[PDB]
Amino acid sequence: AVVKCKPTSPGRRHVVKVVNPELHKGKPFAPLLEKNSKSGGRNNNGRITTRHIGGGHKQAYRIVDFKRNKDGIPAVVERLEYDPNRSANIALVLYKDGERRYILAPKGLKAGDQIQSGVDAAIKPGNTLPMRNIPVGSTVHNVEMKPGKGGQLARSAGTYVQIVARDGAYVTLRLRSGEMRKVEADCRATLGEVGNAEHMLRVLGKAGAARWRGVRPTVRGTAMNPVDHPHGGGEGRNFGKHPVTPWGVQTKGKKTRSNKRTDKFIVRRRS
RNA sequence: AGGACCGAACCGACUAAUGUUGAAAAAUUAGCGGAUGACUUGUGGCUGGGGGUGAAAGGCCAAUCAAACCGGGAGAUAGCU
RNA sequence: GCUCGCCGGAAGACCAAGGGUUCCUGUCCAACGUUAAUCGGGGCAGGGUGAGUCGACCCCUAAGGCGAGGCCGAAAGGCGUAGUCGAUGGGAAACAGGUUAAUAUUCCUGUACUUGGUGUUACUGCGAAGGGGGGACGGAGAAGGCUAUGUUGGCCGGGCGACGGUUGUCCCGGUUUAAGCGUGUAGGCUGGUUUUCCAGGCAAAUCCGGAAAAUCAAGGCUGAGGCGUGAUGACGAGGCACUACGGUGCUGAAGCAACAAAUGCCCUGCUUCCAGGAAAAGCCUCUAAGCAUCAGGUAACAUCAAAUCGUACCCCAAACCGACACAGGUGGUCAGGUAGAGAAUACCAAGGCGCUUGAGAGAACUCGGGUGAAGGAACUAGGCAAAAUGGUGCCGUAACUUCGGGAGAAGGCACGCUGAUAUGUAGGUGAGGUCCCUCGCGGAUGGAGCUGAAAUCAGUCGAAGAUACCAGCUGGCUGCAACUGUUUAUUAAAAACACAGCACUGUGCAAACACGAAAGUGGACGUAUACGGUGUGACGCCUGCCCGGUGCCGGAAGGUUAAUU
RNA sequence: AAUUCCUUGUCGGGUAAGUUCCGACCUGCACGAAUGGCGUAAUGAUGGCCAGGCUGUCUCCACCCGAGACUCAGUGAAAUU
RNA sequence: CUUUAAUGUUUGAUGUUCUAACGUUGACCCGUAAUCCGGGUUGCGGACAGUGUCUGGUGGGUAGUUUGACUGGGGCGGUCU
């Protein structure tokens, strides 16, 4: 639940917590863990390509199954767990055959709840089927964009998409961004929304709370000298030029999509 | 519980005096700040010059930085001393 | 050699890194040493570093590096798979004592341990570049149970005091002993056992996992310390003989208990929180391909092997980095006594030093300090500096406020010593004995002895009892910024930079964007409650008018318009 | 006003006397609403001002303790010219 | 040879469809005890995309450079035949 701390110190007034006792107060499933070394926003060349990334708390990667291709085998939820590599929580499930796997935790999932994947699955949250069988107007998550590769849409805390139509081998969807996309009617999708909706209500309250996430401070650009940024300098706070990224692009309205290749799957775009 | 309080180690460097061919090519003495954290530290590693890195001062990149150092073009050019 | 003085959470002791003979002895004093020098980290010569158990090498891997093929690229070359390197991490085993002018957990003595090879004997399902388990992991906090260690008592030995007194409730010293083996406690986790079945673990599996039953509740794992053994020993203050007073043989007393007690061990635990906490091998198992009077496996005994390199010395410093025998810098371990909350501070122990020019004089002035009549900021750009405050407990404490704070607000009182309450209380610790007992490192009882606050009353000395070192000045109005933090190494620590929060905008994933001739990588093993960029800068009340200009986003009838033809 | 040239604006408070400071006035040379506006408890080695206490900061210096200076012996520089 | 409809062929435009180039940072199989790469099967896209040459626009993102003289000092102003 959302919990507002008390102002026992400057740094605890505006901090807001998102607690959940349903989560496992123990270690995760080790067989489904992997090393995850932080990068610092640097690539094989050692150069910073994405700024404002550095440090943070150590993290281990949980192998989550975004495909959900084990059809015809029921699975019961064992426990809900916390995942630092994503904004949503994950649910450890146990299949009847004795195989355990991690999945995204939908809105109304608990311990003991049953789920299943395939074409002959029931229409309940947590189950996964190709969208050809999902009734129109429904709500799903962890949607595939190409059959078999795995879910790529609606994977965040409280995100979802709504199936709005189905013409042929394609179905039209409205993503959480408002974009009206269409994908093949063979991509698997999971019923229901991802359950951590109260995640957005969280309030860090202090700077150090962002440094635990691996987020480094952001220096604006106005106060940064001409040689280091177009906005640069000026005696005082002048900024008498158009807002612009480094490397010289607007950043305040200019559209930068230049795909051309995948424009046939975008019905409406947004706004 | 706490980027919580006082305060040593530890990390810093606000004031003053001294020193200024210094003990020291930035220190000493007396006080000062932080001191479970955006902390500090050892070892090793990556990022290379119009580039790197930068909680951004044009700061740092081997006592050298508004474009490092070494060599080379090179006996640059110098209507000036 | 006798005194004096200094450090003693080091100015002591042991190491790494680094250095590389500076170590020890003898000899020499030109140069080196900021003076002399018989001395020296100086010169010359000689000697000195002994390991199956410490470390490296080695096995395993992290970041990351190289990278067969391969992809990419004018050439050079770049990225990278399989792989192979790479510790700052994981992985078998030795303790005490004695000894050299200089080394030792390395030599000697004593007592142990570990991993392998071979052979014999006995009993046998063995087998992986595969599966599983385990290794394997965070922060904070809370105690409890222990020890290191210390104090006191007792015991042993010695002593009877350079000056009054000191045969006693006196003084000094010592009272030490390990690994390992055995016991398996305080205490923590766990419910076990048997049989059947199974879409899983790339194939298989008696293993893991899962399902369903039956039968039992005691089964097991981990585990400091303690005790016993180790040890009829060793060491041992001191003695008997030699004694070049340089030291060597023999002998060598007591060698217990209680209390206190860690930041260390139980603890890779328990509790709790969000920021959700390495990998791989060794090791334990599983079977497959395959091999079965073999081979291999297991236990026992015997025997052999455990190589190679390092080991001296300095290591907060005269030996490393700083041009110096330079008030500098340099990571880890050991952590005594009194007072104290304390690793602060003061005085000491062990131990180590007095800082490589001295003597004398006692002017100005300079530096670092002490005191000060009366006044008390009149000094000055400015209370710069200095002075002052300073502790514990009780009492008590304003505006304002985001109700947490402000606040240690301010302010006021009491602190010593002796005695009594109480021949040392409350409290803590806990013996003998008794009772019980699954007869054990047990439980209960028992309260001996030891230790030991705080408070009250009374009395007493001093100018002064938080007496030393140590140790907040306080309050009021106001600007800026919310705050903690960050910054111009070497004249600027700030109202600047960050910041949480807010907003605009971009981005549908082969994402935008960025580094790259490209491959590709990061973004992200993320998927719009997400990522990037811009600006603002907690919170609270708000954020008005203008789209002409520039830019961005959209739309079209027309005009204008490139290559091309 | 961190913004006000004229300017020590005007009035008042505080002082024996206040170009600074506090509070109102508005005549804003040339504030103004996210290059944010106005408030804001707490915080700050932050800027400015007033008090109590305190003192050699000063009136106005005086004495004393030490290290130099001075003399002797030894070693033995430097900028400059 | 002034004139104009159904054709054949000719090429051009718009639209629809297909697959065979090309693409696949979709799935599966082998090389292979390999998330590289390649080959193969299939699916999805599909002559679009993307690349090359040419070309228009944008383009301080990044370079190389210019930004006069006289002058009762220079600058502002004025002046230059």
Curated annotation (Swiss-Prot):
<keyword id="KW-0694">RNA-binding</keyword>
<dbReference type="GO" id="GO:0003735">
    <property type="term" value="F:structural constituent of ribosome"/>
</dbReference>
<dbReference type="InterPro" id="IPR008991">
    <property type="entry name" value="Translation_prot_SH3-like_sf"/>
</dbReference>
<comment type="similarity">
    <text>Belongs to the universal ribosomal protein uL2 family.</text>
</comment>
<keyword id="KW-0689">Ribosomal protein</keyword>
<dbReference type="InterPro" id="IPR022671">
    <property type="entry name" value="Ribosomal_uL2_CS"/>
</dbReference>
<dbReference type="InterPro" id="IPR014726">
    <property type="entry name" value="Ribosomal_uL2_dom3"/>
</dbReference>
<dbReference type="Pfam" id="PF03947">
    <property type="entry name" value="Ribosomal_L2_C"/>
</dbReference>
<dbReference type="Pfam" id="PF00181">
    <property type="entry name" value="Ribosomal_L2"/>
</dbReference>
<dbReference type="GO" id="GO:0019843">
    <property type="term" value="F:rRNA binding"/>
</dbReference>
<dbReference type="InterPro" id="IPR002171">
    <property type="entry name" value="Ribosomal_uL2"/>
</dbReference>
<comment type="subunit">
    <text>Part of the 50S ribosomal subunit. Forms a bridge to the 30S subunit in the 70S ribosome, contacting the 16S rRNA. Interacts weakly with S6 in one of the 3.5 A resolved structures. In pull-down experiments interacts with CedA.</text>
</comment>
<dbReference type="InterPro" id="IPR005880">
    <property type="entry name" value="Ribosomal_uL2_bac/org-type"/>
</dbReference>
<comment type="function">
    <text>One of the primary rRNA binding proteins. Located near the base of the L1 stalk, it is probably also mobile. Required for association of the 30S and 50S subunits to form the 70S ribosome, for tRNA binding and peptide bond formation. It has been suggested to have peptidyltransferase activity; this is highly controversial.</text>
</comment>
<dbReference type="GO" id="GO:0005829">
    <property type="term" value="C:cytosol"/>
</dbReference>
<protein>
    <recommendedName>
        <fullName>Large ribosomal subunit protein uL2</fullName>
    </recommendedName>
</protein>
<dbReference type="InterPro" id="IPR022669">
    <property type="entry name" value="Ribosomal_uL2_C"/>
</dbReference>
<dbReference type="GO" id="GO:0000027">
    <property type="term" value="P:ribosomal large subunit assembly"/>
</dbReference>
<feature type="compositionally biased region" description="Low complexity">
    <location>
        <begin position="38"/>
        <end position="47"/>
    </location>
</feature>
<feature type="region of interest" description="Disordered">
    <location>
        <begin position="27"/>
        <end position="52"/>
    </location>
</feature>
<feature type="modified residue" description="N6-acetyllysine">
    <location>
        <position position="241"/>
    </location>
</feature>
<dbReference type="GO" id="GO:0032297">
    <property type="term" value="P:negative regulation of DNA-templated DNA replication initiation"/>
</dbReference>
<keyword id="KW-0007">Acetylation</keyword>
<keyword id="KW-0699">rRNA-binding</keyword>
<dbReference type="GO" id="GO:1990082">
    <property type="term" value="C:DnaA-L2 complex"/>
</dbReference>
<dbReference type="GO" id="GO:0002181">
    <property type="term" value="P:cytoplasmic translation"/>
</dbReference>
<dbReference type="GO" id="GO:0022625">
    <property type="term" value="C:cytosolic large ribosomal subunit"/>
</dbReference>
<dbReference type="InterPro" id="IPR012340">
    <property type="entry name" value="NA-bd_OB-fold"/>
</dbReference>
<keyword id="KW-0687">Ribonucleoprotein</keyword>
<dbReference type="InterPro" id="IPR014722">
    <property type="entry name" value="Rib_uL2_dom2"/>
</dbReference>
<dbReference type="InterPro" id="IPR022666">
    <property type="entry name" value="Ribosomal_uL2_RNA-bd_dom"/>
</dbReference>
<dbReference type="GO" id="GO:0008270">
    <property type="term" value="F:zinc ion binding"/>
</dbReference>
<comment type="function">
    <text>In the E.coli 70S ribosome in the initiation state it has been modeled to make several contacts with the 16S rRNA (forming bridge B7b, PubMed:12809609); these contacts are broken in the model with bound EF-G.</text>
</comment>
<dbReference type="GO" id="GO:0003723">
    <property type="term" value="F:RNA binding"/>
</dbReference>
<dbReference type="GO" id="GO:0016740">
    <property type="term" value="F:transferase activity"/>
</dbReference>
<dbReference type="GO" id="GO:0005737">
    <property type="term" value="C:cytoplasm"/>
</dbReference>
<feature type="region of interest" description="Disordered">
    <location>
        <begin position="220"/>
        <end position="271"/>
    </location>
</feature>
